[PDB]
Design a protein around this ligand. Structure first.
Ligand SMILES: CCCCCCCCCCCCCCCCCC(=O)OC[C@H](COP(=O)([O-])OCC[N+](C)(C)C)OC(=O)CCCCCCCCCCCCCCCCC
Ligand SMILES: CCCCCCCCCCCCCCCCCC(=O)OC[C@H](COP(=O)([O-])OCC[N+](C)(C)C)OC(=O)CCCCCCCCCCCCCCCCC
Ligand SMILES: CCCCCCCCCCCCCCCCCC(=O)OC[C@H](COP(=O)([O-])OCC[N+](C)(C)C)OC(=O)CCCCCCCCCCCCCCCCC
Ligand SMILES: CCCCCCCCCCCCCCCCCC(=O)OC[C@H](COP(=O)([O-])OCC[N+](C)(C)C)OC(=O)CCCCCCCCCCCCCCCCC
Ligand SMILES: CCCCCCCCCCCCCCCCCC(=O)OC[C@H](COP(=O)([O-])OCC[N+](C)(C)C)OC(=O)CCCCCCCCCCCCCCCCC
Ligand SMILES: CCCCCCCCCCCCCCCCCC(=O)OC[C@H](COP(=O)([O-])OCC[N+](C)(C)C)OC(=O)CCCCCCCCCCCCCCCCC
Lengths: 319, 406, 388, 406
């Protein structure tokens, strides 16, 4: 909750009033930089190394502008989803991974700051929201996993006393978990698409800039951006894919814990509920966004295969 | 007219007035009227096919360079969509009649009549909005095609008869389509007649090629709205079966409501099957032509440069060819999603505190409504947004490959 | 002979008279007739293998150019389909026998006799139509292979083969002519007959499942409790049990089909991939209409037709086998009793698994696979054109 | 030593004697024997990694042409498979012990003891067949590697210090693998010790990789045989509950048999999950290395001319990589299909001619065994024949594109 409370405070679910306007104040500072950068090549005269660096700057600030209100859009959804998540925590492994991510992002940000204030304004604001969406997703997937574990434990307890009331409670818990998963899909459908497109376009930009690098046009130039932003894109897309694929194995636990010998001693009303929930949980929890994208390691492998094919084609054409 | 016919009356009237080979849904079934309508439709078909034959004639007899050949093939394949759809609706009216007659005597249950009426109104609104969008797009396309003729120099590359490998730019009449004519079209009455004929041909062919897709999209929209209504009434349907402090009246009411829900879902499934049967070969032919269209258009965009008539032509052709695919791809994907979500809607109700009949009904619904209803295109591919995404990715990859190899 | 044997009687007759190694379905079992049959089959096989090694040796000892080598390889790969099919049917005859004998003693229920007879008649009509189509296509291509060789010092034989004796002048020319005619006819007939048998196998199961779907509707109307007795419940139980046996028989028959013609399909696809790739390479050097262009177009058309003929039927079976749950929903299960409801639930659970024919587990034989092959070949052809 | 440990005893003994870091399944637990085993394993690891580092440094410091660089990279990536597998089993013995201890106290019901014994014998036969095939392949590969180096001109391309852009072929000692050595490996005692060290290193690395792959295949084979036994005993399991002309003894017997079946299926599912957890990362790393190996090999195959040492070496590398992939792909596909067929086997029983308990058991079995059991490597992909087919197709199409462009 070190940064989950930060989610809450900049989103507005808490008593923070000026901090909410401070979030919108961040939307204006980037807006100042975005319009100024867009006017560089339009009016100002500069060399090739400037606009391309400005293009990386404006593309980065485009993400910054396309993340603040982009995340503030689902204010009520995030509030309700946090309220559901307040009851039960998250696994210790998820706590460790979010701690590691938030420690790395803060430390890695300072590397570029002191690498060589006028330009450092946007350096720190970029890194915080890069970790921000990479921590919210893991926290709110971990709470879902913990609730799934609680549901499995409740079902296992229900298969010891033939308790209709306990099984009804477990079914209600499963329905609430499904509703929360739908809410999570609604919340995260858009930022995941933004991150995936960002990854694709920066992969293309970096591979073109890397093949046109050794020639020497980029001495003390965009290479720092093409390293840092590409690394951030890679880590966020990897986190998203991994924790969207972890949700594909949540229903298997229920599907395997429902198959119990006690099912042959219940009173013919327990059996119908068992069979109905088995039918429901046969299909795993699929994280479908954009009507075409299934967020998982298979999607990550597809992206990697596309990148590898592009690299192979470019290398074959060059040689 | 009641049911889907009254639901789609503007579409039916538009296709009737266009000149397509449709015979039913009349009110003046007399010999003279049927003779006049048959004569008008045959004249329209003859005019359209003669103009198309002239267009393809001005593709091999006057095109020498590869660029001119590509432009001619692009135009011919662009109008091949309308050419195929015209004959398909000419020789396939029975499937359309069967599809339109599926919802003939269906009547909502008295308990869920209000919900059915609300979803019917929503379906009407969606259908009208889609028709308005289609009409606006067709009108804008025709207007732009008419306008762009006068923004360029009508010069055709022709080899010099005196030299060996030298060409000039012979003047050509300013016409919307490069077509050959038995009579001269350089100036005067011939020029005006040719321009009028080409304008009418473009408008009517676009009207047919858009009306077919509009009909398919309207069918899918109605199916989706019916499925949404079925999902919506499931919670009150199950709550009817609660054992709160079962009488014979309650039991018979629950049985009747379950029967009505099952009959409506079976009607939806059969309607989607009829949609697949009626619009399989159309989608197959459309995609087969559009594959070549997009390949040649990507090749043309490879040589694009600056802003000019050629750039605008390539951009417009690409945009229209992608929009035509997307128009039915989005509706196929929406139908797949709405058919797959019925299981979640059924499982998300208060069925645990219900009767054994309600639990059995929920179990059977969860069992069947597991794999989504798919409008397969001639059982070759699955019409959804996956197909459109794959097409866009393939086109972008081909464009990148060409721009790298050139 | 009755059942599947009688249904496939003309195709079986063609197989046993075409020289393929068949030991059953003969009503003249003596101590010598088997000997004449064996010697005739052996002579057919030896002349076929002799012609194959002759064309192979001519290709390997008379090709100096890449185009000539490609054409020779095209001919060899076009005939190797029948080459492998002959040995496949000669060796794995037990799987074919088991698939034929799967439907050997089945007896229809008294209530569904008319439906079973109608669907059996429809299956027979489809089988005869497919046989007619295959025979017509084989005859047409056989006559085409000889009408093309006259439109070309190399003798005008339709096959460029090597022989121990001269084939330029004399009776050797006509004897090579007739031998090559017979070889082409026999090889094409074998290759088409195997696919004919597989397609008949794929259509019989589809007809049986359509019959099951049709009889599902009155199955629960019998059990409807509208104004059961002991006799009614006994009849419903017997009819449900018969339906379950019929579905199990269909599933086992499809499994037998898959086990029977999986490796042969895999080998056919493996050869088809290479010949299609080489044909796509060959089609780039087109110089208008001529003998070479006609030959390339014919090879491509036959290669596509051979795969598509069974791909469409496999896809039809896959698409139709999933409709049994639709029929189970169609029949008014809400009017049935608890036993009927449980049977419907179990049937739906089973039917949520489409009957899929697998080519030795590597791929699913369907129009999806046909479209994948078409796309790969077209993409390769386009890439070759762009690079050239 | 009973159960899967006794089942895999030859493989366990080979792993113990092969220098891999293992600590359990020993009968000499003494303060001296364990120390000697630790020193032996440490010496083996040190020698292996020293030889690998020598290969890497030679490849880095003595590669001038792209062909030489490609050959060195192919060899280094070929042996990084064994490097990764060794370092993976060294630090991951706990998961392997957990997987091996799953079938610890399992016992079969008296009714199905004959079927259990028959399928146990079948599993033993399959495991012994797999071990024999693995040993034969490894020994043959080592022998071929030893023979091939004697069948060519041992010369290395070097640039000319006398001229600007000229080169020659300098004599190089005839070794099993090209590598750097601190001592004088040119001839004599240094040459023979280098050759024997190379032979031992190649044999031991191939053994280290093949033992792990055979262990995974044996795990999958045992799971498949257990699933086969469960499928087979279904006929007597459901026949026992038949109501044909129930007594208390028969009822308790069928209940006990049903409990045994449920426990056995749960055990099999947990065992498959344990296999997936234990041997997923290794498969992912193997595929990551193998895709690059196959890309470079497809590039190198386009340079094959006639029949010679280079062509034979490239063919051998490709064959070994494809065999390594196929070895686990086939077993993954077998497990997938043989777990998916359980529903068909259960439905094919005489479940109608049985009690309501039998009907419910069949219903729940069909409901549960609908999703096939899948072994996945770190959730990146599903280990099956589809992965092997995709890899083969990608390699073939890359080779075709390269040979057509070149
Ligand atoms: C290529 C240039 C991209 C430049 C990007 C720079 C920023 C430009 C701003 C627009 C770009 C997109 C921003 C995020 C999306 C904003 C709109 C939105 O939320 O749309 C949601 C919508 C869908 O809404 P949804 O998913 O929120 O709704 C789902 C919820 N139900 C079902 C209930 C309705 O998606 C789209 O409109 C599609 C996005 C298309 C554009 C992005 C495609 C990225 C592809 C990258 C390459 C991938 C390669 C591998 C692919 C493997 C599989 C094929
Ligand atoms: C999914 C879309 C992704 C796009 C790529 C997909 C792969 C390609 C699939 C379609 C096949 C393409 C066939 C050739 C067209 C492209 C030619 C090209 O690139 O060069 C432009 C060529 C010329 O360009 P060029 O590449 O020769 O370059 C020379 C240019 N100069 C001389 C200026 C240097 O265009 C033409 O020649 C005009 C068109 C030729 C006539 C085409 C008639 C089509 C007949 C259809 C027969 C059946 C086809 C079935 C298709 C469906 C199969 C699934
Ligand atoms: C709210 C929901 C509804 C809204 C969303 C859906 C709206 C519909 C979307 C598609 C509408 C398409 C309308 C135009 C179709 C015209 C087709 C046609 O025939 O055109 C060829 C024709 C010409 O074809 P021609 O050249 O063969 O005809 C001329 C003939 N001679 C040579 C003899 C004179 O017209 C055009 O060229 C079109 C001109 C206008 C094109 C405007 C395109 C947009 C502006 C540029 C692109 C900017 C964004 C993209 C950036 C780059 C991306 C790659
Ligand atoms: C209801 C079902 C209806 C459909 C079923 C019936 C139709 C089946 C269609 C497939 C038929 C396949 C068999 C016939 C072909 C013979 C195959 C064969 O062996 O040929 C090689 C043989 C010759 O092989 P050869 O070359 O080895 O023999 C001569 C050898 N030398 C030269 C050395 C002596 O015959 C041919 O060449 C036949 C070619 C006939 C082509 C006639 C049509 C040409 C134009 C077609 C369309 C052109 C492209 C149009 C666009 C693309 C298509 C839409
Ligand atoms: C040809 C490409 C370059 C050479 C090959 C590169 C592949 C990786 C080589 C490094 C060795 C990795 C294994 C050694 C250590 C294994 C220890 C272990 O248990 O690991 C599993 C554990 C996970 O544990 P677990 O919970 O999965 O359990 C493992 C199972 N037991 C318990 C039995 C051990 O950690 C890892 O996932 C590995 C972390 C270190 C990874 C090494 C760094 C390199 C990563 C790849 C770099 C290249 C990526 C390219 C991507 C595509 C780009 C376009
Ligand atoms: C029921 C199931 C039954 C079993 C079915 C499955 C069977 C097994 C399937 C896989 C087969 C694997 C076979 C071994 C693969 C070896 C892989 C390998 O490491 O290869 C690379 C190495 C060699 O590649 P290299 O390049 O690393 O070695 C060169 C070393 N330097 C550079 C120092 C010179 O192995 C080989 O030697 C492979 C050669 C092919 C094997 C052919 C057998 C004959 C060998 C002697 C040839 C002698 C003639 C040569 C000259 C001719 C006259 C000029």
């Amino acid at each position: 909750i070190d940064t989950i409370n930060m989610f809450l405070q900049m989103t507005g679910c808490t008593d923070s009033k000026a901090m909410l306007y401070l979030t919108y104040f961040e939307f204006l500072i980037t807006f100042y930089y975005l319009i100024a950068t867009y006017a560089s090549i339009v009016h100002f005269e500069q060399s090739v190394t400037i606009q391309l660096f400005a293009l990386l700057c404006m593309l980065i600030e485009c993400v910054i502008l396309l993340n603040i209100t982009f995340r503030l859009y689902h204010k009520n959804h995030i509030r309700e989803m946090h309220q559901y998540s307040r009851r039960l925590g998250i696994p210790d492994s998820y706590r460790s991974v979010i701690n590691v991510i938030t420690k790395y992002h803060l430390i890695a940000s300072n590397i570029f700051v002191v690498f060589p204030l006028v330009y450092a304004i946007s350096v720190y604001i970029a890194h915080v929201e890069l970790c921000f969406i990479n921590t919210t997703f893991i926290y709110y997937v971990g709470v879902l996993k913990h609730r799934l574990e609680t549901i499995v434990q409740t079902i296992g307890e229900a298969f010891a006393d033939n308790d209709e009331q306990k099984f009804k409670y477990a079914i209600i818990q499963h329905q609430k978990l499904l509703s929360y998963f739908n809410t999570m899909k609604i919340v995260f459908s858009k930022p995941i698409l933004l991150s995936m497109s960002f990854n694709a376009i920066y992969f293309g930009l970096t591979t073109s800039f890397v093949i046109q690098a050794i020639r020497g046009y980029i001495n003390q130039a965009i290479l720092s951006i093409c390293i840092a932003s590409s690394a951030a894109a890679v880590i966020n897309i990897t986190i998203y894919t991994f924790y969207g694929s972890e949700l594909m194995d949540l229903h298997d636990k229920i599907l395997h814990v429902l198959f119990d010998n006690a099912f042959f001693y219940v009173s013919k009303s327990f059996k119908s509920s068992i069979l109905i929930m088995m039918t429901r949980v046969t299909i795993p929890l699929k994280f479908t966004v954009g009507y075409i994208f299934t967020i998982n390691l298979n999607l990550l492998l597809k992206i990697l295969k596309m990148s590898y094919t592009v690299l192979n084609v470019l290398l074959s054409s060059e040689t | 007219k009641d049911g889907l016919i009254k639901d789609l009356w503007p579409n039916i009237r538009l296709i009737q007035l266009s000149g397509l080979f449709i015979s039913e849904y009349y009110d003046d079934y007399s010999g003279l009227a049927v003779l006049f309508r048959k004569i008008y439709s045959w004249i329209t078909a003859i005019i359209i096919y003669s103009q198309f034959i002239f267009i393809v004639i001005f593709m091999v007899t006057k095109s020498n360079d590869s660029d001119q050949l590509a432009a001619g093939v692009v135009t011919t394949l662009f109008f091949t969509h309308s050419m195929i759809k015209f004959v398909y609706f000419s020789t396939g009216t029975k499937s359309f009649y069967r599809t339109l007659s599926c919802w003939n005597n269906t009547s909502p249950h008295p308990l869920f009549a209000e919900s059915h009426s609300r979803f019917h109104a929503k379906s009407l609104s969606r259908m009208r909005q889609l028709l308005i969008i289609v009409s606006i797009v067709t009108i804008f396309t025709t207007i732009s095609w008419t306008t762009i003729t006068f923004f360029g120099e009508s010069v055709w590359k022709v080899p010099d008869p005196e030299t060996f490998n030298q060409t000039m730019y012979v003047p050509v009449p300013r016409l919307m389509l490069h077509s050959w004519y038995p009579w001269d079209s350089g100036h005067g009455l011939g020029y005006i007649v040719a321009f009028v004929l080409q304008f009418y041909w473009v408008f009517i062919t676009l009207s047919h090629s858009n009306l077919m897709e509009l009909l398919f999209s309207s069918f899918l929209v109605h199916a989706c709205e019916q499925l949404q209504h079925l999902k919506e009434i499931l919670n009150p349907l199950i709550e009817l079966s609660a054992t709160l402090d079962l009488t014979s009246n309650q039991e018979v009411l629950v049985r009747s409501a379950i029967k009505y829900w099952v009959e409506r879902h079976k009607h939806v499934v059969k309607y989607v099957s009829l949609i697949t049967e009626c619009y399989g070969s159309a989608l197959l032919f459309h995609m087969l032509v559009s594959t070549v269209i997009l390949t040649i258009l990507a090749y043309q965009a490879t040589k694009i440069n600056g802003v000019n008539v050629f750039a605008f032509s390539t951009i417009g052709y690409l945009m229209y060819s992608f929009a035509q695919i997307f128009m039915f791809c989005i509706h196929g994907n929406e139908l797949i999603e709405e058919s797959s979500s019925v299981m979640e809607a059924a499982y998300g109700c208060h069925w645990y505190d219900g009767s054994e009949e309600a639990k059995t009904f929920v179990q059977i619904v969860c069992q069947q409504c597991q794999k989504p209803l798919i409008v397969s295109g001639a059982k070759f591919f699955n019409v959804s947004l996956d197909l459109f995404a794959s097409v866009l990715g393939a086109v972008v990859t081909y464009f990148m490959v060409l721009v790298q190899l050139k």
